[PDB]
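Illustration 12: Interleukin-2.
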Amino acid sequence: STKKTQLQLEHLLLDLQMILNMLNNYDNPKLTRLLTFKFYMPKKATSLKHLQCLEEELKPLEEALNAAGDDPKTIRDVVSNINVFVLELKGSETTFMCEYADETATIIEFLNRWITFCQSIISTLT
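Figure caption equivalent — predicted structure in token form:
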């Protein structure tokens, strides 16, 4: 029950941090090209149901990463893995209406928000 939810959060955390380190190894133009894409942050992220606001951004996230031009199949497999464990945590269908903030954010702030999100809930389960 709890270890199952904890494990799915650790698989989701592993995918998110893999993108962060992939961003840190990008060229300065490639990084600048990534930061020109807008990402919407949820106004609240304290429950598993708030992962719906992460799922709705996986298609923009994949489109942003493919602008760097490293590898289209690797980006496809990592974002698909995120979509798998997000649906495993908050449900297979859309049952929550997300409320996003007025200000957009870069891909760095986007990943840092959900990484801290996964790490927070894991600490309460462990």
